[PDB]
Amino acid sequence: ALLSFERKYRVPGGTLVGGNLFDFWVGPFYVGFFGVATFFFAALGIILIAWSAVLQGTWNPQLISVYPPALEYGLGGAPLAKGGLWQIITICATGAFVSWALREVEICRKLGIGYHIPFAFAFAILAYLTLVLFRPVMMGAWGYAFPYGIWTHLDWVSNTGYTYGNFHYNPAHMIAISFFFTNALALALHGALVLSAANPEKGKEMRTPDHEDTFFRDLVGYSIGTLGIHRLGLLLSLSAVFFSALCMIITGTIWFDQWVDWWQWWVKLPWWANIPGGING
């Protein structure tokens, strides 16, 4: 139940609510008030999803889908059968996630470390909240939000994209994607660099972070260093998601036509709009 070194850290304290009431573990899991909170929300959510499943008439996880209230309901409520359950499940989802973040803060306090992790998580929650809460509200109906179902949610992404032509042309989305790819590049390299110093050629001794700096300089002419790479990862990650939220908060709202056509602002700029030749004249 404990790691060989863990006991010294399982001291009282760090909670935000309830003092010592919920200050304990269950197995490896820390609990706290927000352990009890996420459990409650998560369990109500699953029970509602399970009950939504019986009303749809299925139990296959690749068919269960809790669809948001049809657009006619606007921003009001819907019968449970025909929208209500999604709305309540969404309330539970946000409850569960926000609680999970606040629980992470509690663990951080008890462990004497920085609050970086829940701060990072907050970005994912914000992304979710853009799709299910902020965007639909600016648009004026819950029906624009995505449904909760393995494939039905992919159907939604596809139909939502093609509403605006090839969604590749959304420029916030272009930046989003670049951060995603760059992040995964940076993850590969980081993983492999540290591993290549920890695991040198057979029989040779562990290399040193100097070797890591040396290796990369030799290769690309620069090395960000061991603090930098951890800052970089965190920044590329959160940036990807930041721009994901942005690229969707503006779609359906400030821009709602075909994205490819937005690029005509550049090409019609007065000083070159009318010069012959090229692709556009």
């Binding site: 139940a1 404990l2 790691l3 060989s4 070194f5 863990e6 006991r7 010294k8 850290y9 399982r10 001291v11 009282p12 304290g13 760090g14 010592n20 200050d23 304990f24 573990w25 269950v26 197995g27 306090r109 008890k110 462990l111 004497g112 470390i113 920890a198 029989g203 040779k204 001794e205 562990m206 290399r207 040193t208 972070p209 100097d210 070797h211 700096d213 040396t214 260093g225 061991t226 603090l227």
Partner: protein, 235 residues
């Protein structure tokens, strides 16, 4: 069908990847223990991996992990319940006792060495050709603790030679001795350095170093541990 075999093969691959990966992540902290240190009944579904040995540079031996795990340390704590899963109260001053968020590990009592076998971290005094290059230079700034009282003066930056980075601020207390404060736990300001973790009266209690011109891994751990713990234990 060729794709239907491709995907089937891959799920099996991925299954063994996860197995490999999860067993790899058991080279530390295991075999699991009960709160009394004896080995837990239930160790999980994954076995301990075959040991691996790291050859440490500069004649410092090897490390073979998964190995006999011990704290090499008294842990000043006592149970607060009659069953698993509850917190463990400090039996003295947790800052002094190195428990909780004040914890330290009994790491090796030598300094981390750079790629040339020279001490990784040096006071800027001894760091040939090293100077502050951007930002406010803290050297000379009074250091203030969370009780808004002056705990001392900054007398040097302790720098990482290889990575060219500030790592501690050596601070001089009222009696003339010095402590190291990690860079990551101080806020440099135009006219002071602010240490929110410690009250001015807890600075004397920071763990000192054997030699004034190097710091060992054991010592970095006591210092960092001590200063982190203040967030919980000064308040």
């Amino acid at each position: 069908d060729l794709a239907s075999l491709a995907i089937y093969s891959f799920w099996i691959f991925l299954a063994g990847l996860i197995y490999y990966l999860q067993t790899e992540n058991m080279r530390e902290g295991y075999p699991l223990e009960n709160e009394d240190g004896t080995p837990a009944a239930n160790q999980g579904p994954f076995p301990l991996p075959k040991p691996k040995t790291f050859i440490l540079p500069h004649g410092r031996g090897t490390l073979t992990v998964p190995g006999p795990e011990s704290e090499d340390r008294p842990i000043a704590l006592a149970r607060t319940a009659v069953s698993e899963g509850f917190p463990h109260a400090p039996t003295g001053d947790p800052m002094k006792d190195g428990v909780g968020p004040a914890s330290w590990v009994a790491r090796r009592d030598l300094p981390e060495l750079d790629g040339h076998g020279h001490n990784k971290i040096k006071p800027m005094k001894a760091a040939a050709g090293f100077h502050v290059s951007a930002g406010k230079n803290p050297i000379g700034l009074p250091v203030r603790g969370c009780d808004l009282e002056i705990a001392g003066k900054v007398v040097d930056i302790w720098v990482d030679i290889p990575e060219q980075m500030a790592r501690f601020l050596e601070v001089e207390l009222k009696d003339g001795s010095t402590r190291l404060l990690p860079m990551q736990m101080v806020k440099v300001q135009s006219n002071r350095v602010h240490v929110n973790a410690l009250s001015s009266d807890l600075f004397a209690g920071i763990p000192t170093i054997k030699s004034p011109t190097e710091v060992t891994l054991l010592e970095e751990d006591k210092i960092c541990g001590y200063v982190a713990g203040g967030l919980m234990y000064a308040a």
